[PDB]
Write a protein that binds this ligand. Sequence first.
Ligand SMILES: [Mn+2]
Ligand SMILES: [Mn+2]
Length: 546
Amino acid sequence: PALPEPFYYLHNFRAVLAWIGERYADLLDDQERAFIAAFAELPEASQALLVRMVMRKGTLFREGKLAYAEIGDTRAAVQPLLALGWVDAQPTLELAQLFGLLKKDELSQLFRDHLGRANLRKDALLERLQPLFPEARRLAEWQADFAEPVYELRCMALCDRLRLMYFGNLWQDWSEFVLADLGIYRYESVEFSADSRGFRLRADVDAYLHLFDCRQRFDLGEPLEELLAGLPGEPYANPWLEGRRVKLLFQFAQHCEKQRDFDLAQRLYRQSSHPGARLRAIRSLERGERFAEAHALAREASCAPESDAERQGLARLLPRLQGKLGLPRQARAAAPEIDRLDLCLAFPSEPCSVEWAVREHLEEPGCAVHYVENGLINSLFGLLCWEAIFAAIPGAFFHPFHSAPADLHSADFRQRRAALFEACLGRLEDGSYRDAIRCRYRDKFGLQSPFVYWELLGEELLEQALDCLPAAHLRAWFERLLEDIPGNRAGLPDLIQFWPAQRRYRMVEVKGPGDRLQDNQLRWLQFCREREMPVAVCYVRWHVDD
DNA sequence: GTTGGGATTG
DNA sequence: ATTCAA
DNA sequence: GAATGTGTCTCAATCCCAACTT
Ligand SMILES: [Mn+2]
Ligand SMILES: [Mn+2]
């Protein structure tokens, strides 16, 4: 809604350039330093223009779309950049690309002679015409009576490299700068180090691009046979960067299981240390009619499971596999009594989701019901332990746009902060946790964070939950979430009802018609009935009056 | 003349 | 977070 | 009991441009 200087975007970009200049100094190229120096030389209007095309979706641009008052004359402004080889008039265009720049009418005009079928949707015209014109051409070789030049940015790879270096990733755009200055995103500010950085070695960055490239080509239909050749068969020394590879292999293997080539899926899964990969491997060997290997792997697994989620699903596999090897089946006890509560209910209608239905039914005078589904517990954990999460641990923050420390899913995350996590959870054992949370709720409100859900967490909910939830149950929860952060933020029950009168609560997971407990949920209920925490599963039928 | 999607803006 | 198999 | 529709990257106006309506 108007920031005072019309050149705000280029100012932001010059910031990024200088930042890379002083932090990633020792990591740079001849190409890269050449680019930064060259960009400094350029006049203001041409710098600005370059930035406008960098920030925009395409790589090609009709001169008409490049209309800006701060820049003024597009053609006068683009000359320095054409000279530099960073922009390209008369680029050579594939026919899809040409369909991207021109309008439908212009193209019905231009191909009037090779088309008479019918005026139909534009994409279908492209389908009809790519057979005919297989070769690319300059723009004048398509039509030379077209009155508008067209420019191709040819330095987008170097810019992507820079954006990667700044953010440590490739999903955050440059608008992070303007969105945060309008107060739309609002991040927490951390004093990190004067030489904190996302990437220590250059070959790391080289590898993040390589992996990213592999994910992209995969999403456009390329066969694994050459993708797999292109990946490293040997792990990476960087921990976080091996994380990204191992995930990639995982998805390759999911694709593999869809096509029902099970043996390659077993292979790929087995060379991955991803969460719950080993379990997909056993399941694929089973699906591949390979029971001795699968049994073998499952017995290897139940020695030291990666996770609770792995135990839970081993308890299903291992019998099934013993069966399929002709080994006698084995005794067990049943799933501990699901604390079941039924409700016949009026047919909405119109809907009116189930959880709102129950939320209203159980909401009586004297009893407050909230729909939260683990927003409330992750929230109270985020608030208590804020200054732990946002502690300035070396390498963990390195620009002003972090919603979360970069080592949050790291397995040494607890360790590195154990000092401040015992300090913060310790506030539960005194009386001070109530107040500390109400202060942190007031100060940190609206701050992008990984754990707090400010929209959901009103003042009524925070007060009631504060005075109704015992601290021993909270210690029990925050310890569990800390244990396996990405696996245990997941399955907590839909509703929480409080009786503020008696400072007591009960969480209720609502299951509608033909809905059953998912695995994370079942793990959470087990954990709860082991601390004698009030949970209950509510199964809902409907009732139509015939 | 109107609707809906995707890009662009600050 | 929804669908087949018996 | 299993499968298979998501990827976390949750900002609102505004403009352009296909597509539909008689
Ligand atoms: Mn739910
Ligand atoms: Mn539910």
